Swiss-Prot record, chain A:
Flagellin is the subunit protein which polymerizes to form the filaments of bacterial flagella. This is Flagellin FljM. Belongs to the bacterial flagellin family. It comes from Caulobacter vibrioides (strain ATCC 19089 / CIP 103742 / CB 15). It is found in: Secreted; Bacterial flagellum. It comes from the Bacteria. In C.crescentus, the flagellar filament is composed of multiple flagellins of 29 kDa; 27 kDa and 25 kDa.
């Protein structure tokens, strides 16, 4: 019983709550996708000046 | 005499079982310390828990 309680204690100290991690992963993939879109929009900013000259 | 030897082995088992109950070097039922404190909020208030020696 003591080994069971101690293993349960170390597991409470270390184990991640995966249900939170799944939502964190979903939000982070959506964030990375919007960030690549914003990066492309930043890359296109300099093109317009060719019309000036 | 047999019942007394049983009683003595029983009280010895209580002593050992009470002594070995620790976590990461700290115990509350051991009687080594009167109380344990644990963080309760951002500014450092503690959740006091008093010891109960066994």
């Amino acid at each position: 019983k003591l080994q069971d309680s101690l293993d349960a204690g170390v597991g409470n100290l270390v184990d991640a709550d995966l249900a939170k991690e799944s939502a964190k992963l979903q939000s982070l993939q959506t964030k990375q996708q919007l960030g690549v879109q914003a990066l492309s929009i930043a890359n296109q900013s300099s093109s317009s000046i060719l019309s000036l000259f | 005499n047999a019942l007394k030897s049983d009683f003595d082995s029983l009280r010895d088992q209580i002593t050992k079982a009470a002594s070995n109950a620790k976590f990461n070097g700290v115990s509350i039922a051991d009687g080594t310390t009167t109380k344990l404190s644990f963080l309760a909020n951002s500014d450092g208030s503690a959740f006091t828990v008093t010891a109960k020696t066994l």
